[PDB]
Amino acid sequence: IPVIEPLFTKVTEDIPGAEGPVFDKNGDFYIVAPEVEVNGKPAGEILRIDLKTGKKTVICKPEVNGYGGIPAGCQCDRDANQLFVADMRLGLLVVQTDGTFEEIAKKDSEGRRMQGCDDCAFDYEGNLWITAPAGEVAPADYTRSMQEKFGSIYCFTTDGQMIQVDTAFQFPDGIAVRHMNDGRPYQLIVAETPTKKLWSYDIKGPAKIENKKVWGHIPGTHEGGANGMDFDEDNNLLVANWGSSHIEVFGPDGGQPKMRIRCPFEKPSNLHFKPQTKTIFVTEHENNAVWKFEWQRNGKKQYCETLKFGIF
Site string for Ca ion, 89-118 (x = CB under 5 A): -----------------------------x
Beta bridge partners of 273: 280
- Report d(CA 182, CA 24) in Å as an integer: 24
Q: Least distance (Å) from Ca ion to the CB of residue 241? A: 12
Cβ closer to Ca ion: 230 or 248? 230
Cβ closer to Ca ion: 119 or 284? 119
Q: After which residues is the chain broken (C to N over 2.5 A)?
A: none
Q: Least distance (Å) from Ca ion to the CB of residue 72? A: 5
User: Exposed/middle/buried for 46, CB within 10 Å: 0-12, 13-18, 19+?
Assistant: buried
At residue 303, the 3 state secondary structure works out as helix
Q: Is 246 a catalytic residue?
A: no
Q: 271: closest CA among 292, 297, 302, 246?
A: 292
User: Which position among 45, 123, 230, 248 is part of the footprint of Ca ion (CB under 5 A)?
Assistant: 230
User: Which position among 56, 89, 272, 285 is part of the footprint of Ca ion (CB under 5 A)?
Assistant: 272
Instruction: Tell me the DSSP string of 170-206.
Output: SSEEEEEEEE-TTS-EEEEEEEETTTTEEEEEEEEET
Q: Least distance (Å) from Ca ion to the CB of residue 291? A: 14
CB-hemisphere CA count at 13 Å for 186? Answer: 8
232 touches Ca ion (CB under 5 A):
no
Q: Least distance (Å) from Ca ion to the CB of residue 312? A: 25
Q: What is the CA radius of gyration of the chain?
A: 17
Contacts of 229 (CB under 8 A, 6+ apart): 174, 175, 176, 189, 191, 198, 237, 238, 239, 240, 271
Beta bridge partners of 164: 154
Q: Least distance (Å) from Ca ion to the CB of residue 34? A: 9
Cβ closer to Ca ion: 161 or 274? 274
Set 179, 246, 272, 285: catalytic member: 285
Residue 238 main-chain phi, psi, to 5 deg: -95, 130
* Cα torsion 36, 241, 146, 212: sign: positive
Cβ closer to Ca ion: 20 or 126? 20
260 touches Ca ion (CB under 5 A):
no
119 touches Ca ion (CB under 5 A):
yes
192 touches Ca ion (CB under 5 A):
no
Q: Least distance (Å) from Ca ion to the CB of residue 230? A: 4
Q: What residue is closest to Ca ion based on CB?
A: 272
At residue 239, the 3 state secondary structure works out as strand
Site string for Ca ion, 125-164 (x = CB under 5 A): ----------------------------------------
Cβ closer to Ca ion: 87 or 119? 119
Contact range with Ca ion by CB under 5 A, out of 121-129, 140-148, 200-208, 268-276: 268-276
**Phi/psi-derived region of residue 235, left when phi > 0, alpha when psi is between -120 and 50, beta in every other case:** left
Catalytic residue positions, numbered:
285
Chain positions contacting Ca ion, by CB under 5 A: 118-119, 173, 227, 230, 272
